[PDB]
């Protein structure tokens, strides 16, 4: 009897820890990717401004 | 000039308030059904109009169909009264 209820309650806490912890790790990774891909687009916008300046010069 | 608008407004307000009343009943039924049975849901929402001659025998048939599940009832139980107009 009692050992099943203990194991299921411990596994209930395990599910509630894991699903949230995986979502938190995804949130952090998506935020890092947002910054990295933004910088790549910023380099292209910078290169346009520099080419445009060289043309005006 | 108040009476005509009042009767039309009260027709609309009664329809919306009564519809909303049954929506709260449906939500109470839903929330209790979830809390009674858990998330792998397979419950049927059901409507009955009890006959005044047979309402006692109705409770006995309802109990016979559902006594294994567990005023109070082993199934989810709620009511609607049409006497709103007195």
């Amino acid at each position: 009897s009692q050992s099943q209820g203990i194991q299921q309650l411990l596994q209930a806490e395990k599910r509630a820890a894991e699903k949230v912890s995986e979502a938190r790790k995804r949130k952090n990774r998506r935020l890092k990717q947002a910054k990295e891909e933004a910088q790549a687009e910023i380099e292209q916008y910078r290169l346009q401004r520099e080419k445009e300046f060289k043309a005006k010069e | 000039k108040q009476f005509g608008p009042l009767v039309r407004w009260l027709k609309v307000n009664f329809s919306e308030a009564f519809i909303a009343w049954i929506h709260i009943k449906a939500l109470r039924v839903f929330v209790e059904s979830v809390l009674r049975y858990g998330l792998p849901v397979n419950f049927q929402a059901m409507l009955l109009q009890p006959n005044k001659k047979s309402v006692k025998k109705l409770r006995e048939v309802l109990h016979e169909l559902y006594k294994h599940l567990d005023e109070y009832y082993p199934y989810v139980y709620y009511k609607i009264d049409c006497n709103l107009l007195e």
Binding site: - | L35, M46, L47, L48, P50, L65, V76, L85
Partner: protein, 163 residues
Amino acid sequence: TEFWLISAPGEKTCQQTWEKLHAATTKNNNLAVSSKFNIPDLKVGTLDVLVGLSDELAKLDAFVEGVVKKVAQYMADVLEDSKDKVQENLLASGVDLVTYITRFQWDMAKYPIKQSLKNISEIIAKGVTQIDNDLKSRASAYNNLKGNLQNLERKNAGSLLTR
């Protein structure tokens, strides 16, 4: 006239217990006129919210019953004559109480089933709160004209000593 709303599980699927029930409740005798009822699937979650909803929806049930019953009383108060027609004016969805109860449908346009139970509950509470605000307005509109006409009629009533 009274109706009961019930919910219970199937044996494996929802049909199996209900299919046995409605037969016993209609074939032994007419114990009740018996059918399915139209409750949708809704966005469910934590017990902490589902239990909160169980008591909040109960306070709301008492409130919305109070609102709809006050609308019916206001119809009975405006109909100072032709009181037998009150049920033909207290329609819901353009039909009688017993009809819309028996033929109920969830309003998916006013209450989009994809939303949380909390959102749906608040949308109902806001709507019926504005019906209560409209009833405070319409009581003030009706009761002043009623009282003023009763006083005017009283000033015209009685003998030469009072009219």
